[PDB]
A paper describes a structure:
Interleukin (IL-), an IL-6 family cytokine, has pivotal roles in autoimmune diseases, fibrotic complications, and solid cancers. IL-11 activates downstream signalling pathways by binding its two cell surface receptors: the IL-11 specific receptor, IL-11Rα, and the signal-transducing receptor, glycoprotein (gp)13013,26. Following the formation of the receptor complex, the Janus kinase (JAK)/signal transducer and activator of stat (STAT) and extracellular signal regulated kinase (ERK)/mitogen-activated protein kinase (MAPK) pathways are primarily activated. IL-11 and IL-6 utilise a homodimer of gp13026,34,35 while other IL-6 family members exploit a heterodimer of gp130 with a second signal-transducing receptor, such as LIF receptor (LIFR), OSM receptor (OSMR), IL-27R/WSX-1 or IL-12 receptor β−2 subunit (IL-12Rβ2).
To understand the molecular mechanisms underpinning human IL-11 signalling complex formation, we solved three structures of the complex containing either the cytokine binding domains of gp130 (gp130D1-D3) or the complete extracellular domains of gp130 (gp130EC) using electron cryo-microscopy (cryo-EM) and X-ray crystallography. We also obtained crystals of the IL-11FL/IL-11RαEC/gp130D1-D3 complex that diffracted anisotropically to 3.8 Å. We used the cryo-EM structure of the gp130D1-D3 complex to phase the X-ray diffraction data by molecular replacement. Three IL-11 signalling complexes were arranged in a triangular configuration in the asymmetric unit providing 6-fold non-crystallographic symmetry to aid refinement. Satisfactory density defining the positions of the β-sheets of IL-11Rα D1 facilitated refinement of the domain in the gp130EC complex and the crystal structure, confirming the average positions of this domain in the complex. N-linked glycans were visible on IL-11Rα (N105, N172) and gp130 (N21, N61, N135) in all structures.
Author numbering:
A (entry chain B), D (entry chain E): 15 to 178
B (entry chain C), E (entry chain F): 3 to 131, 141 to 294
C (entry chain A), F (entry chain D): 4 to 301
């Protein structure tokens, strides 16, 4: 499908941007330990063979995770603290590319006449960081979780092409 | 009876400067027994009064290393014990690796040899924030220094647990490992170089995937090629598309070395080691 | 309170057209001074309007008709000739004239690495009126933010949103002024075919080995290599030559970070320069890199 | 008096600025007839010999008139209509010079220990213009009245020096 | 009796195309009287029946201009009347001026002469938005074409009223005049030019106020000087401070013309006419 | 919840001084892993801090002392060595260093005709810290609006209020940064003595009359003549001369709009240029006018 080809190309682009900024961040603000947040999804639970699964669940699952990540990325910029102004304008560019891709995903489902998932209840607001450094620690958890989601997204979209 | 042994059935172990408690192996706990030093007739004593089932040595120094004899008062040899002195194990050195995206494997070496029998318990768990608790890592042939984990989650993080134990104590090495970080594919195979007729400064290089990497649309590999003419000191680097690359700046009339390496197509893990060099010469 | 007013309030008309202005006096003002439309004289910018161009419609209103309007700015005043030896102002208006905007043509866009999408267009005939320019772009499923041109650069706009490659975008420019509204033709394209990469940097020449007549060129490619495949043009000439030569494009038709130039004369100094663009030739050539010098071995 | 000398020099400067802008305005937007406003002062009622009068009345009288003119000039800028934007930035510069001179007048009275006049009740708001051209007509009345006030101000201040 | 006359005591006036009504001057109103045309014996009649105190002519054309005689039936000459034909006055032409800041004066001329006796009524008022109503402007010597207003308000506006009236109607000229706009001082007096020893290209010009301008700290005058060497076509202009100006670019050995004009020190009104030229020659 | 924090949050210190950082662990974190201050290791920007610089104060806190601080930016991290074969981050802070601002010197202002007052000053030693500059000016009876320097021109400011001649104004610059606040010396002056007029325009030379060797210069003075009396400097030279000559200032020491230059050679071409400034020499000379050419008569 020509429409599926175009969407996959843009996903690889966003994955590369996320990896570079995450690696740049650890060089300037090193992280010691794997950081987690209760408000971030922890849906990235699977092995290799997971390709096996069907299309409706993957697209629904991708959409829910990315909307949470968009909220968290935007939250980081407006209130993360002056310590993270150095991650601009790259962080703001990353935010803008992600909102449009979510739109592209809704269009893909519409053009393929797929059932749309029910509007899930949006997650409550993230509390502001307790300190400037707490926001930096939160960024490591967010970027690591994002690039993992995107890594599994590229793979999954390529698998569907292999079937339909 | 007495604390059952570690290795062989009638030998016990101890640490210098400690208290060591020898037991008579083939004697019922509660039977009075006599103790001698080899070649020395003196009935030995120990801190709890003088006639038990177990000799104790608070001395524990090197002169106390050797063979001890215990016998019941009838004259029957109730057994023999050898006191070998040593030290608790040091923390072992652990490394893991993975040449594919499904399974990985880890190996371990002692950081210090004690001269005492040694063995390793290995296990691992998945940190979260389906019993994801501690899962054993079975050691595949015999009790080799290698275990394999099949069907691991590619993106999840695992805490690998190698714990060394000896007859005098234990030390556990823990190593965090994520499949997405540790992965390193094997180099491509079958690198061949051919002349390009009509073009005195072009060579065509071709190669295939490594056999340890099954070709699949889900995990491609990207490639990085380096080439260097014989006698030249500096490598030239290209980032080829696909399994072929036409070099266009080959020096005329000279053998050229070419080598390539592999990496996960989504830049996961690290680049492979360089393939064996293959040589060709332009037409 | 005033005696009257002129209608329309402040019209703008097209050159060579006609305009009729009507001044109407309130009954109360006409009564106090005992006058009517016949007493109205019109003057503009110190020039007396000739009585013959007036037309008295009602006893309250007089009117004038301008033909082939040719002045860009007309200050119109309506006056009455009180008790025949004085003049007082009833009303006034400012008349502005000009032309409608021309249809924008030759619309083209360019994405300079590190900058947001920028589009350029040819403006047409001068209109003499304050004209606003807004660059429009929108997807089939989303209407996008307007781009308002800057005072300094009214014929160019630079969007405020980051470029998104691999997605077709519909773009057009909308020109509008007091005398008319018109839209340029719509264009459709993939931003990936309109990239203008930065020029190569980190240029190195390296001296020759145990073999002479050979020079290897090295440089660091621009970060943009992660989205598109680069193609290059390598030019070279002798330190004394007047024109540049060029390597056959076919030999440098794909991404690379080095090239060894051959058949150069021994112990001769050579100057090099390079440029790059998308491998398929769809886009714009980057600028020339920094000049580089080198010397062949003995 | 050195203080009186300085104040007189600044008044001549403001008079010249007002005359130039008033004359510039009639060149671009001619006026037909003498325009008046009920809200403007009409205190400029006197002949030549009026120099005769005493100092407290002149300073009190100058202060009251100028405060009304300041209100009217500021009123013209913010709401006179787009037709009069061409009179900027000169009109805004004129406004700024006038507020400070009023301050200088209060300082003069303080330094000379003169009785200060009682705070008079400020005039109600000027109605907005009924049309853009009504604002232009209002400007002719205001500028003519201002430059007349300033012309008589220069003369009066010079007369006091001649006595004390 | 009858409407009393305008000028001389026994002459009346009329307009062509109108009705004109002659009266017998020295006859009681109500006495029957007879009328004749000079040299013609016919008893004249008029539209109201035939025997009154007043002859009327609806004709009124040029042939009707001349001398008429009225007499009572006794034969006594009750008087003589002359019919002179004319037209109502045209609007007069009025100008005002002022060479000082206190008083001003205005003059007037007919815009058209009728050939009939004429006189002017002059007055003025102060427009507001102390009787500021209509105030007469007295004509100082005899009944000249000039009136003077003393102690005028410098900043107030005045509406000057010259109204022409003749025996057949009236026409009023109104002229708005403000002292601050109309003022024009006389030129300075006594312009003298002197050489400047030691400097072959400098001249010193000096002058005084005009006598019509009393020197006062309240109304100074600013000055504008122009100078030109003999045979030169173009004036040079300076804006001197004070009553003196040293010219520094005088052409050596040549007569120079210098002239100056005056204006209100606060740029009120307009510049005076140029003084008579005064000449000097550098040393 | 986190294990601890470092205090002070984000300090800024002066070069060559000392800084002590204290990391404190919460009781709950110490209990779960069974550790205390003795287990803290400090690392910064990939460099292991040597254990010998640590000082364990309480069982909950460890501290390090830096001497002769020389790094402009230090990223500090506090870590604990859990169960001896792993390391987890407790807290982190960023240490910034630099110097206090130097006292601004050589403060001077200038009023360019048509522009608002502008003041210039010499900044001192680089401070390596983000420093804001605000120009202060105030009357004895009024505190005036602050002038905030522009990113491009941090050593200059242009006020937003129009210039008011004939009134003394008190002006000074205030320099402040994270390490210190200081004010420049206060200056006092009348704006009338700091005017920089525009250069003369409308330059005319006029040809010679029936007498030769004479040229009259005419021009239009700048509008600023209404507030100050102008003085001029007229320079002239022959079309081939290499240097300019000048009329004696005393002869052109007062406002004028023309001047006749004498003793010039017949049928010779002359070039002129003029400049002006306040008559008393208090202020700044304007730029040179446009060049003018002329020819003497036959
Ligand atoms: C890493 O893996 C090793 C091996 O599985 C772990 O050593 C294990 O340590 C636990 C203590 O947490 C031992 O539990 C036992 O509890 C009983 C009852 O209280 C007691 O008798 C033992 O002395 C011991 O405390 C467990 O036996 C031991 N494993 C082996 C094979 O001996 C280590 O804890 C792991 N570390 C992790 C997962 O972080
Ligand atoms: C300008 O001045 C002249 C002279 O003063 C004014 O002519 C004057 O006109 C008024 C009418 O407004 C005359 O009033 C008279 O009223 C009586 C009673 O009704 C009537 O019998 C007269 O025929 C006339 O209407 C006044 O007589 C006349 N002045 C003279 C000397 O004859 C003129 O109105 C003034 N215009 C202004 C001030 O605008
Ligand atoms: C005199 O002419 C004016 C001008 O046309 C008339 O005013 C117009 O009246 C119509 C409706 O009656 C309105 O639609 C127009 O807008 C009015 N014109 C303006 C300029 O406002 C007016 O009614 C006429 N009066 C008479 C008595 O005929
Ligand atoms: C251990 O040391 C810390 C560090 O000084 C102590 O915390 C300080 O307590 C005082 C008052 O008790 C506060 O003013 C300081 O602000 C605290 N320091 C910090 C960094 O917050 C702590 O009280 C000490 N604990 C014991 C048991 O001695
Ligand atoms: C991974 O383990 C499975 C389980 O037997 C095996 O079939 C597969 O071949 C292994 N992967 C590779 C690359 O050998
Ligand atoms: C008035 O307008 C008409 C049509 O726009 C035009 O033909 C004509 O020349 C104009 N001028 C007139 C009628 O004077
Ligand atoms: C465009 O038109 C609007 C009309 O409201 C006007 O206010 C504005 O100044 C014009 N120019 C720009 C750049 O917006
Ligand atoms: C103005 O009139 C008064 C009144 O008599 C007179 O004294 C004075 O001299 C006049 N002014 C001039 C300048 O003549
Ligand atoms: C600590 O600070 C003091 C005073 O500021 C200084 O003399 C000393 O050299 C510094 N360094 C130390 C004590 O190591
Ligand atoms: C000056 O300091 C403030 C501190 O709140 C900061 O926000 C600002 O960015 C700095 N620079 C300027 C130009 O205001």
């Amino acid at each position: 499908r020509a429409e599926l080809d175009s969407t996959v190309l843009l996903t690889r682009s966003l994955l590369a941007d996320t990896r570079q900024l995450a690696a740049q961040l650890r060089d300037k603000f090193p992280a010691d330990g794997d950081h987690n947040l209760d408000s971030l999804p922890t849906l990235a639970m699977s092995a290799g063979a997971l390709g096996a699964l069907q299309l409706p669940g993957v697209l629904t699952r991708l959409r829910a995770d990315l909307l949470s990540y968009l909220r968290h990325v935007q939250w980081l910029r407006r209130a993360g603290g002056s310590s993270l102004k150095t991650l601009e304008p790259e962080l703001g560019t990353l935010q803008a590319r992600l909102d449009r891709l979510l739109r592209r995903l809704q269009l893909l489902m519409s053009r393929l006449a797929l059932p749309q998932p029910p509007p899930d209840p949006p997650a409550p607001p993230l509390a502001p960081p307790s300190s400037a450094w707490g926001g930096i620690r939160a960024a490591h958890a967010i970027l690591g979780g994002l690039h993992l989601t995107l890594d599994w997204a590229v793979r999954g979209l390529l698998l569907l092409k292999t079937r339909l | 009876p007495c604390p059952q042994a570690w290795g062989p059935p009638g030998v016990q172990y101890g640490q210098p400067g400690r208290s060591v408690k020898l037991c008579c192996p083939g004697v019922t706990a509660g039977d009075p027994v006599s103790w001698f030093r080899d070649g020395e007739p003196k009935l030995l004593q120990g801190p709890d009064s003088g006639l038990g089932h177990e000799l104790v040595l608070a001395q524990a120094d090197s002169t106390d290393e050797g063979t001890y004899i215990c016998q019941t008062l009838d004259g029957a040899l109730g057994g023999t014990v050898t006191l070998q002195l040593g030290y608790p194990p040091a923390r072992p050195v652990v490394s893991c690796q993975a040449a594919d995206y499904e399974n990985f494997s880890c190996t371990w070496s002692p950081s210090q040899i004690s001269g005492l029998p040694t063995r390793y318990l290995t296990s691992y768990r998945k940190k979260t924030v389906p019993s994801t608790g501690p899962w054993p890592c079975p050691q595949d042939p015999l009790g080799a220094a290698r275990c394999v984990v099949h069907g691991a989650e590619f993106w999840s993080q695992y805490r690998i647990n190698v714990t060394e134990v000896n007859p005098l104590g234990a030390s556990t090495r823990l190593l965090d490992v994520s499949l997405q970080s540790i992965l390193r594919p094997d180099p491509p195979q079958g690198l061949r170089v051919e002349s390009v007729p009509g073009y005195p400064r072009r060579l065509r290089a071709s190669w295939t995937y490594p056999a340890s990497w099954p070709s699949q649309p889900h995990f491609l590999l990207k490639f990085r090629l380096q080439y260097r003419p014989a006698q030249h000191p500096a490598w030239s680097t290209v980032e080829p598309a696909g399994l072929e690359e036409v070099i266009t700046d080959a020096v005329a009339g000279l053998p050229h070395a070419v080598r390539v390496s592999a990496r996960d197509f989504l830049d996961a893990g690290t680049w492979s080691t360089w393939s064996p060099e293959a040589w060709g010469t332009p037409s | 309170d005033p005696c009257g007013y002129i209608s329309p309030e402040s019209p703008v008309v097209q050159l060579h057209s006609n305009f009729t202005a009507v001044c109407v006096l309130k009954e109360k003002c006409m009564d106090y001074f005992h006058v009517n439309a016949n007493y109205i004289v019109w003057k503009t910018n110190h020039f007396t309007i000739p009585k013959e161009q007036y037309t008295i419609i009602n006893r309250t209103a007089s009117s004038v008709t301008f033909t082939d309007i040719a002045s860009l700015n007309i200050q119109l005043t309506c006056n009455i000739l009180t008790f025949g030896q004085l003049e007082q102002n009833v009303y006034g208006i400012t008349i502005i004239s000009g032309l409608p905007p021309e249809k924008p043509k030759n619309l083209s866009c360019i994405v300079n690495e590190g900058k947001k999408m920028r589009c350029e267009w040819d403006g047409g005939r001068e209109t003499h009126l304050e004209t606003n320019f807004t660059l429009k772009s929108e997807w089939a499923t989303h209407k996008f933010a307007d781009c308002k041109a800057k005072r300094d650069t009214p014929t160019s706009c630079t969007v405020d949103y980051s470029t998104v490659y691999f997605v077709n975008i519909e773009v057009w420019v909308e020109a509008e002024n007091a005398l008319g509204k018109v839209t340029s033709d719509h264009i459709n394209f993939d931003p990936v075919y309109k990239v203008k990469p930065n020029p190569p940097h980190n240029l190195s020449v390296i001296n020759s080995e145990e073999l002479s007549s050979i020079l290897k060129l090295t440089w660091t490619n621009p970060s943009i290599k992660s989205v598109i495949i680069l193609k290059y043009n390598i030019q070279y000439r002798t330190k004394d030559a007047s024109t540049w030569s060029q390597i056959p494009p076919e030999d440098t038709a794909s991404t690379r970070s080095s090239f060894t130039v051959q058949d150069l004369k021994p112990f001769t100094e050579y100057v090099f320069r390079i440029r790059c663009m998308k491998e398929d030739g769809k886009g714009y050539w980057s600028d020339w890199s920094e000049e580089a010098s080198g010397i062949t071995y003995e």
